[PDB]
Each structure stands twice: as structure tokens, then as C-alpha cells.
């Protein structure tokens, strides 16, 4: 059961879903939760063994009352060998109750069993709020089906570069083709009892006038008439005037108080602070408590932790909650990978305190601009949003994996597991990856390297590790059980199966038959770095972190040093002179060379490059109006036309 039921009691009979069954709720209930048990019911006919499905208040679940957990969203479900009972809290709460139900039900068969459960967070889901491609209309609907099975109830939509939730085009409504799109998104999303929150970011141009004051509320009009019933106003990452405060705790209010509070069925109304994390708080500056002061009590503010990216702490949620007067609605930034675009993020979701729920009033992720691969910690994070107390790191991301691609579980387990780290980056945010193998890496390379004597079985747990990591691959871009999946990982599976080929290769230098061998997986060494090299200029190539990297933590380092290593033990041992660099680069120039996009550059007295290029700029610290280049004699930037 993803997410764990606050309360569970299992009895060891097992009872067969009837054959024969009667009804009692039908017309009663939430019509969502019908039709889910409607279809675990098909073949099955309608005397026979009693199931009650039903909210409080309904006649069908009268009897029941007590038992249903008065919570929102809670529900009480019970199969024996008698009967079966459904029955929420509310609404959501009986469509909660056959999520659950839908588990059990393994093979006909059901366990004899009485839950009692309801959410530990009032708020969790997700937030589309990246930088990058939007998701894609079908990614979309995918994930709205996905967020209701795994009791999720929030998805705020706010991608950065949307221009019509962005500055300028915010003001302007959604053109004809994208408003149905949206309009149909809405209808899934109450389907699957999901709330769509429309988010704008108007911050950057606004004017704080009644022009742009009125250019916003008719837009979530428009949004409204396209069935949207919860609205978020976002500030963060902006500059100038869009951050006053005061300013946007009145603009916050205005909109409260002339259209949440104006309409009959508006549900949650949200804010982003621009300070939206501690340490880009101005210590003792008076943004928070303005907002927390002036804020109408019922206004969500969105919060980040101690950090641009990092994991929630008592302490933290602590220290801004006393700012702002309220439970901080979390904006979770894992698994987004929008200033780390060369990596997939797929590990485990961990590192968030599991005893403050009381402290937050709202949880959500926001993701990476990869949808089907951020289904990992998705479905993780609803697991620990719903019952964070019994939050499983592994075993959630474990069944996870097996729920979004059963038929080749293990190999996702594999890819995913060396693909979890970010690298070094500008927020300090890191990931541990591929831990079961890094002490046999450690030691391997450790003694490897000081002439002393490697333990065998840490030789075999490696070899090992690049046979499973070949498997993986291959079997992974073959899949079609979930293809936009494959279609998202593809540039880094191949890299990932290069990878493990070069390490088998290296290996295989370091057992090292005879002279002749050696050269001969040298050389295949070097074509599998040329190989890479040309997957990173020509796959993924976005503007800020182009490329694909994978293993990055533990595996391509060992790879890397071990390679430069065994060379540098041949060229002594045989007198000889092999380049022992690690990464291939067609370009000539003591620090390594880099190609990003048209850019030759010199990591942080003569360039060669590969060919004559028309030059454009040279960006030195401490334009060529296209003249021809091939050499530059003397940050330390060539651009060149590619
Ligand atoms: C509140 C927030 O995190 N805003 C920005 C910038 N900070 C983190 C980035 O990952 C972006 O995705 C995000 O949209
Ligand atoms: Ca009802």
C-alpha cells in the first residue's frame, strides 16, 4: 500500500471479490469512487454480498459513522467475509478509499482487512514550476491519472517559460488552442480529484496599478470560466518593483477579497514569496513579516527550506512558520534538474524531516521537465506527504519503479540508482549514488593506485556492476511498456551503456594479458571517450548545462582514474608515451580544454582547434567579426560559428 494507511489492521483470511455482489451507495456517492469500483467490478453482478460505498451523511454508510477518521480526505474501509465498506470522510475521501481498495485487490482475491486513514499533509502534489520545456498536453494527462492514484490532491501548473503564465504575456489569455488544452486538463484533474491550481508570475513587469491590477483578476477569470477553482500568485526570481512586499500582500488581498472570496467554489489560493528560502532572506529585513503580517489568514505562502534547494528540518519550518504566522506550504525543489541539465535526478526521495506535518500546510515537488522520470519521486513524495511517520525511503522508491515499469523493475533500478547525484553546482545540492558498489570502488582505486595489492572480489563487484549496467541499457531503449519514459532517458541510457563499456575496457587493461592487448583496449577506450564526447555535444544541447552525464559520483571517476592510472604504470613499465587523459577533445591548447555549444574554453598561451571556424568573440577575464581561426595565441572563452 503506496501511500501507508495511517491505520491497518490485516487478518490473514483472504476473501474472493463476489461474484455476486448488491450495491448499497451508488447514486449516493462520489461518482469518481463509483466508477473506479464499477470497473474492479466488471464480470460481477448486482442480492450477493453487501458493499457500501458512501460519504458521511449518506444513508449507505450511516452505520459506519464512528468509524470514518474525521479528517478531510479520511475514510474508513473494511472487507470481510460479510461485506465490504467504502466510505470517506468527504468526497475525496471515498475516492481515497478505492485507491486503496484497488491495491488489495490482488488476483480476484482480497485480504480480510479494516483501515483507518486520512492525510498527515492537507496539501500534496506538485509543482510544474521548472525552467525548460513544459511538459508536453499527453505528459499532462498522465500524470493528473497518476496524482489521483497515489491520493495526491494538488498539482500547480507554472512553468517558468510558459509566456502566458510569465512576464509580459501573463497578462494575456491563453490562445484558443491552449485554452481547450487547458480546459481539458481541468476536467481530468476534478476526475481524478486533483486540484488544478493555475499559478501566474507577473512580478518582473508589474506595475502596481489598477491597469495591471485588473489585466490580473480578469485573467484568473478567464482561467475560471475554464474551470480552474484554485489560483497561486507567484514572486520568486524576480527583480525590482514586482517584489515589494506590502505591495503584493495587497494585491494578494484585493484578489482575495474581490474573487476568492467572491466566488462560490474557489479552493486554495497560494503565493511564492520572492525571499522563498533562509538564506536569501535579508536578515532582519522586514519581507517575511510584512507578508505574515498582512496576508489574509487563509493565503498559502510557498517556502523552500534553508536553502534555493534543500530538505525541510524541524528547525527550519520552525523558523519560518514564526515569520510568516502560518504552516509554510513547502515547495520542495527535488527532483528538478533545471540548473543541473545534464543529469537525470531518479534516486530516492530522503532528507525531509518525518515528524513535522503539523508544521506544514502544504507539500509539493517541484520536478524535473523529464515527467515520466520524475514519476520516482513523485510517487514517493505522495507516499511521504500522506504518512510521513511510516515514510520508507528505498521501499517507496522500490515500488515506485516496479508501479511505473513493472515489466523491467530491476533494470530502471539499476539506471536509476547510478543516475541520482546532481554534481557540483551552484546551490551545493548533492545526492549520494551507486552506495552499494563506492567501498569496493574506494578500495579498488586506493590500492590500485599506491602499488599495493587489490582485494579480488572488489575486482569482480566492479566487473560485475558494468555486466548489470549493460543489461540495464540495452534492455531499457527496447522497452515499450511506458515509451515516453524511453523517449525522456535515452540520450543517457546510451551514455550509461558507454560508460559501463569503458570500465569493463579499463578493467581488462589492468588484468592486461601482453603488450599487444593492452594497446588494443586502450584503443578501445579512446573511441568509447570519443563516443561520449560526441553524445554530450549532440544530445540534449540547452543553452545553460548542454550534454549528458551519468554515473557521475562514483563510477565514471573510478573509470577515469583507473585509466589514467594503468597507463601511467605501461608507459613506465614499457618505456612508452599513451596520453593517459580521460576525456576526449578534438581541440589542442595545463588546464583542460571544454566544449559547450560554440564555445572553446579554458577551465576557470595557444589554442589549436580541429579546423578553420569563423570567429565571433573572444571573452577574457581576469568580437572577431567572423575572421577566419584555427589558432589563438596570448574565465578565457573562443565563440566560434558552428
Ligand atoms: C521558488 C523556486 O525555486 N523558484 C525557481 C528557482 N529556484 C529553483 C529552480 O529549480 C526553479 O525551478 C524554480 O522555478
Ligand atoms: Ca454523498
Same mark, same amino acid.
Given at each position: 500500500?503506496?501511500?501507508?494507511?495511517?491505520?491497518?489492521?490485516?487478518?490473514? =483470511?483472504?476473501?474472493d471479490?463476489?461474484?455476486?455482489?448488491?450495491?448499497?451507495?451508488?447514486?449516493?456517492?462520489?461518482?469518481?469512487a463509483?466508477?473506479?469500483?464499477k470497473?474492479?467490478?466488471?464480470?460481477?453482478?448486482?442480492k450477493?454480498?453487501?458493499?457500501?460505498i458512501?460519504?458521511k451523511?449518506?444513508?449507505?454508510?450511516?452505520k459506519y459513522? !464512528?468509524?470514518?477518521?474525521?479528517?478531510?480526505?479520511?475514510?474508513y474501509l473494511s472487507?470481510?467475509?460479510?461485506?465490504?465498506?467504502?466510505?470517506?470522510?468527504? /468526497?475525496?475521501?471515498?475516492?481515497?478509499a478505492?485507491?486503496?481498495?484497488?491495491?488489495?485487490?490482488?488476483?480476484?482475491?482480497?485480504?480480510?482487512?479494516?483501515?483507518?486513514?486520512?492525510?498527515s499533509?492537507? @496539501?500534496?502534489?506538485?509543482?510544474?514550476?521548472?525552467?525548460?520545456?513544459p511538459?508536453?498536453?499527453?505528459?499532462?494527462?498522465?500524470?493528473?491519472?497518476?496524482?489521483?492514484?497515489?491520493?495526491?490532491?494538488?498539482?500547480?501548473?507554472?512553468?517558468?517559460?510558459?509566456?502566458?503564465?510569465?512576464?509580459?504575456?501573463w497578462?494575456?489569455?491563453?490562445?484558443?488552442?491552449?485554452?481547450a488544452?487547458?480546459?481539458?486538463?481541468?476536467?481530468?484533474?476534478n /476526475?481524478?480529484?486533483?486540484?488544478?491550481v493555475?499559478?501566474?508570475?507577473?512580478?518582473?513587469?508589474?506595475?502596481?496599478?489598477?491597469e495591471?491590477?485588473d489585466?490580473?483578476?480578469?485573467?484568473?477569470?478567464?482561467?475560471?470560466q475554464?474551470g480552474?477553482?484554485?489560483?497561486?500568485?507567484?514572486?520568486?526570481?524576480?527583480?525590482?518593483?514586482?517584489?515589494?512586499?506590502?505591495?503584493?500582500?495587497?494585491?494578494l488581498?484585493?484578489?482575495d /477579497?474581490?474573487?476568492?472570496?467572491?466566488?462560490?467554489?474557489?479552493?486554495?489560493?497560494? *503565493?511564492?514569496?520572492?525571499?522563498?528560502?533562509?538564506?536569501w532572506?535579508?536578515?532582519?529585513?522586514?519581507?517575511?513579516?510584512?507578508?505574515?503580517?498582512?496576508?489574509?489568514?487563509?493565503?498559502?505562502?510557498?517556502?523552500?527550506?534553508?536553502?534555493?534547494?534543500?530538505?525541510?528540518? !524541524?528547525?527550519?519550518?520552525?523558523?519560518?512558520?514564526?515569520?510568516?504566522?502560518?504552516?509554510?506550504?513547502?515547495?520542495?525543489?527535488?527532483?528538478? +534538474?533545471? @540548473?543541473?541539465?545534464?543529469?537525470?535526478?531518479?534516486?530516492?526521495?530522503?532528507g525531509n524531516?518525518?515528524?513535522?506535518?503539523?508544521e506544514? +500546510?502544504?507539500?509539493?515537488?517541484?520536478?524535473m521537465?523529464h515527467?515520466?522520470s520524475?514519476?520516482?519521486?513523485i510517487?514517493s513524495?505522495?507516499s511521504?506527504?500522506?504518512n510521513?511517520?511510516?515514510?520508507?525511503?528505498?521501499?517507496?522508491?522500490?515500488d515506485?519503479?516496479?508501479?511505473?515499469?513493472?515489466?523491467?523493475?530491476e533494470?530502471?533500478?539499476c539506471?536509476?540508482?547510478?543516475?541520482?547525484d546532481?554534481?557540483?553546482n551552484?546551490?551545493?545540492?548533492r545526492?549520494?549514488?551507486? *552506495?552499494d558498489?563506492?567501498p569496493?570502488?574506494?578500495?579498488?582505486?586506493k590500492?590500485?593506485?599506491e602499488?599495493?595489492?587489490y582485494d579480488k572480489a572488489?575486482?569482480?563487484?566492479?566487473?560485475?556492476?558494468?555486466?548489470?549496467?549493460?543489461?540495464?541499457?540495452?534492455?531499457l531503449?527496447?522497452n515499450?511498456?511506458?515509451?515516453?519514459?524511453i523517449?525522456?532517458?535515452?540520450?543517457?541510457? $546510451?551514455?550509461? =551503456?558507454?560508460?559501463? /563499456?569503458?570500465?569493463e575496457?579499463?578493467?581488462?587493461?589492468?588484468?592486461?594479458?601482453?603488450?599487444? @592487448?593492452?594497446?588494443?583496449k586502450?584503443?578501445?577506450? =579512446?573511441?568509447?571517450?570519443?563516443?561520449?564526447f560526441?553524445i554530450?555535444?549532440?544530445?540534449?544541447?540547452?543553452?545553460?548545462?548542454?550534454?549528458?552525464k551519468?554515473?557521475? !559520483?562514483?563510477?565514471?571517476?573510478?573509470?577515469?582514474?583507473?585509466?589514467?592510472?594503468?597507463?601511467?604504470f605501461?608507459?613506465? =613499465?614499457?618505456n612508452? $608515451?599513451?596520453?593517459?587523459?580521460?576525456?576526449?577533445?578534438?581541440?589542442?591548447?595545463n588546464?583542460?580544454?571544454?566544449?559547450?555549444?560554440?564555445?572553446?574554453?579554458?577551465?576557470?598561451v595557444?589554442?589549436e582547434?580541429?579546423?578553420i571556424?569563423?570567429?565571433?568573440?573572444?571573452?577574457?577575464?581576469?568580437?572577431?567579426?567572423?575572421?577566419?581561426?584555427?589558432?589563438?595565441?596570448?574565465?578565457?572563452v573562443?565563440t566560434?560559428?558552428?
Amino acid at each position: 500500500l503506496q501511500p501507508p494507511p495511517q491505520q491497518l489492521i490485516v487478518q490473514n =483470511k483472504t476473501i474472493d471479490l463476489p461474484a455476486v455482489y448488491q450495491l448499497n451507495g451508488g447514486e449516493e456517492a462520489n461518482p469518481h469512487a463509483v466508477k473506479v469500483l464499477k470497473e474492479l467490478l466488471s464480470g460481477k453482478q448486482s442480492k450477493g454480498m453487501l458493499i457500501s460505498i458512501g460519504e458521511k451523511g449518506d444513508k449507505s454508510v450511516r452505520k459506519y459513522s !464512528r468509524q470514518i477518521p474525521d479528517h478531510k480526505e479520511g475514510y474508513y474501509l473494511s472487507v470481510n467475509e460479510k461485506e465490504i465498506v467504502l466510505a470517506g470522510n468527504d /468526497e475525496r475521501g471515498t475516492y481515497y478509499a478505492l485507491q486503496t481498495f484497488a491495491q488489495l485487490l490482488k488476483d480476484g482475491k482480497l485480504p480480510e482487512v479494516e483501515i483507518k486513514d486520512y492525510p498527515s499533509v492537507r @496539501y500534496r502534489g506538485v509543482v510544474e514550476g521548472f525552467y525548460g520545456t513544459p511538459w508536453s498536453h499527453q505528459a499532462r494527462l498522465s500524470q493528473l491519472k497518476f496524482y489521483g492514484k497515489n491520493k495526491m490532491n494538488t498539482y500547480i501548473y507554472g512553468p517558468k517559460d510558459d509566456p502566458y503564465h510569465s512576464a509580459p504575456n501573463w497578462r494575456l489569455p491563453y490562445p484558443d488552442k491552449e485554452a481547450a488544452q487547458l480546459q481539458e486538463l481541468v476536467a481530468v484533474a476534478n /476526475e481524478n480529484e486533483v486540484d488544478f491550481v493555475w499559478a501566474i508570475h507577473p512580478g518582473q513587469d508589474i506595475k502596481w496599478n489598477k491597469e495591471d491590477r485588473d489585466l490580473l483578476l480578469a485573467k484568473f477569470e478567464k482561467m475560471y470560466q475554464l474551470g480552474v477553482r484554485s489560483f497561486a500568485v507567484f514572486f520568486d526570481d524576480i527583480s525590482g518593483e514586482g517584489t515589494n512586499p506590502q505591495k503584493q500582500a495587497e494585491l494578494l488581498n484585493y484578489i482575495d /477579497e474581490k474573487f476568492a472570496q467572491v466566488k462560490p467554489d474557489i479552493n486554495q489560493l497560494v *503565493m511564492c514569496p520572492t525571499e522563498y528560502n533562509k538564506s536569501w532572506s535579508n536578515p532582519n529585513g522586514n519581507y517575511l513579516t510584512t507578508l505574515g503580517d498582512k496576508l489574509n489568514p487563509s493565503i498559502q505562502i510557498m517556502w523552500t527550506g534553508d536553502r534555493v534547494i534543500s530538505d525541510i528540518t !524541524r528547525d527550519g519550518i520552525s523558523w519560518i512558520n514564526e515569520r510568516i504566522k502560518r504552516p509554510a506550504y513547502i515547495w520542495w525543489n527535488f527532483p528538478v +534538474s533545471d @540548473y543541473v541539465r545534464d543529469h537525470l535526478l531518479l534516486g530516492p526521495v530522503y532528507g525531509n524531516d518525518t515528524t513535522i506535518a503539523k508544521e506544514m +500546510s502544504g507539500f509539493v515537488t517541484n520536478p524535473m521537465e523529464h515527467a515520466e522520470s520524475s514519476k520516482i519521486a513523485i510517487y514517493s513524495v505522495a507516499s511521504y506527504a500522506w504518512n510521513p511517520a511510516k515514510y520508507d525511503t528505498w521501499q517507496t522508491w522500490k515500488d515506485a519503479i516496479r508501479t511505473i515499469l513493472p515489466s523491467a523493475a530491476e533494470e530502471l533500478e539499476c539506471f536509476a540508482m547510478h543516475n541520482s547525484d546532481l554534481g557540483p553546482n551552484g546551490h551545493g545540492y548533492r545526492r549520494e549514488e551507486s *552506495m552499494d558498489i563506492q567501498p569496493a570502488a574506494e578500495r579498488f582505486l586506493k590500492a590500485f593506485k599506491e602499488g599495493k595489492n587489490y582485494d579480488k572480489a572488489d575486482f569482480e563487484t566492479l566487473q560485475y556492476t558494468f555486466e548489470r549496467m549493460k543489461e540495464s541499457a540495452d534492455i531499457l531503449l527496447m522497452n515499450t511498456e511506458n515509451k515516453p519514459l524511453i523517449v525522456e532517458i535515452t540520450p543517457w541510457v $546510451h551514455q550509461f =551503456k558507454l560508460t559501463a /563499456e569503458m570500465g569493463e575496457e579499463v578493467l581488462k587493461m589492468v588484468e592486461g594479458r601482453n603488450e599487444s @592487448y593492452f594497446l588494443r583496449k586502450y584503443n578501445h577506450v =579512446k573511441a568509447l571517450q570519443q563516443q561520449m564526447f560526441y553524445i554530450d555535444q549532440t544530445s540534449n544541447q540547452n543553452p545553460y548545462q548542454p550534454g549528458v552525464k551519468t554515473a557521475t !559520483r562514483v563510477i565514471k571517476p573510478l573509470i577515469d582514474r583507473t585509466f589514467a592510472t594503468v597507463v601511467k604504470f605501461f608507459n613506465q =613499465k614499457f618505456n612508452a $608515451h599513451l596520453d593517459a587523459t580521460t576525456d576526449y577533445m578534438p581541440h589542442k591548447m595545463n588546464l583542460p580544454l571544454q566544449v559547450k555549444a560554440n564555445r572553446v574554453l579554458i577551465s576557470p598561451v595557444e589554442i589549436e582547434l580541429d579546423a578553420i571556424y569563423p570567429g565571433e568573440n573572444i571573452q577574457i577575464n581576469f568580437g572577431l567579426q567572423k575572421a577566419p581561426v584555427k589558432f589563438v595565441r596570448f574565465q578565457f572563452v573562443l565563440t566560434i560559428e558552428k
